[PDB]
Amino acid sequence: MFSIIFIALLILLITTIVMFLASILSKKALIDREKSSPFECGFDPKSSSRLPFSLRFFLITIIFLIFDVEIALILPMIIIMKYSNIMIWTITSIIFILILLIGLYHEWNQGMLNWSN
Amino acid sequence: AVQQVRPILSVDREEARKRALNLYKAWYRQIPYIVMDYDIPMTVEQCRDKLREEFVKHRNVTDIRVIDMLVIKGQMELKESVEIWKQKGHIMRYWKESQDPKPTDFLSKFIQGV
Numbered sequence A: 001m002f003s004i005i006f007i008a009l010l011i012l013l014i015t016t017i018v019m020f021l022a023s024i025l026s027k028k029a030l031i032d033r034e035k036s037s038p039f040e041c042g043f044d045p046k047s048s049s050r051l052p053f054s055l056r057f058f059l060i061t062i063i064f065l066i067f068d069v070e071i072a073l074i075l076p077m078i079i080i081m082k083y084s085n086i087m088i089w090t091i092t093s094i095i096f097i098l099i100l101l102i103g104l105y106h107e108w109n110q111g112m113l114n115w116s117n
Numbered sequence B: 001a002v003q004q005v006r007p008i009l010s011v012d013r014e015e016a017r018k019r020a021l022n023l024y025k026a027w028y029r030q031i032p033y034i035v036m037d038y039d040i041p042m043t044v045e046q047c048r049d050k051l052r053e054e055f056v057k058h059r060n061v062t063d064i065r066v067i068d069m070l071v072i073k074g075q076m077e078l079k080e081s082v083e084i085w086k087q088k089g090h091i092m093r094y095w096k097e098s099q100d101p102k103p104t105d106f107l108s109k110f111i112q113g114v
Helices: A002-025 A057-074 A085-110 B015-037 B044-056 B066-084 B089-091 B106-112
Strands: none
Touching: A057 A085, B015 B044, B015 B066
């Protein structure tokens, strides 16, 4: 691994050096009150502009986590399949996926993504 | 020399003041927000001072109808400043800081041309 670690450190150092170098290569200009404003198509930005956090994107990412963990559970099936007892490996894995489908199809009839808002 | 004519909003001079002073409330209450929202030099006291003079701009308005319209204009400009449709240039417009007060006494006029 540490061969990988050192290479990444080397790259990152070379990366920052390049961007550090470009920071000196690019000519400077006297700062301007307006040059450093948020871009709002050329009309003054409104109040703070911090978006509302009343929304669903956490909800989708929570679906991600559930399936992301479930993915973790099924990752090792590749290797153990040669070793594990076949009934248990067969049925056990099959019901994983089956429950996933039924969760999905039950959830389509729920249709939770088609929120009213 | 009187005419029997339609109204617009206000039926009596006192209702006119009632409407006119309502506007003065919105503008007084708004000023702090614009000082924050619009990144312009002006400060609260100056903005308040101008608001006073800018009502004094027309003190001797007399007709009920005319004063009604002046308020109609104000309610509009209030909303355009309340929400930020306007721009820092537009809001500062009330000060006219690009042009120096031109000469006024006769010699300065005379020595500086018509």
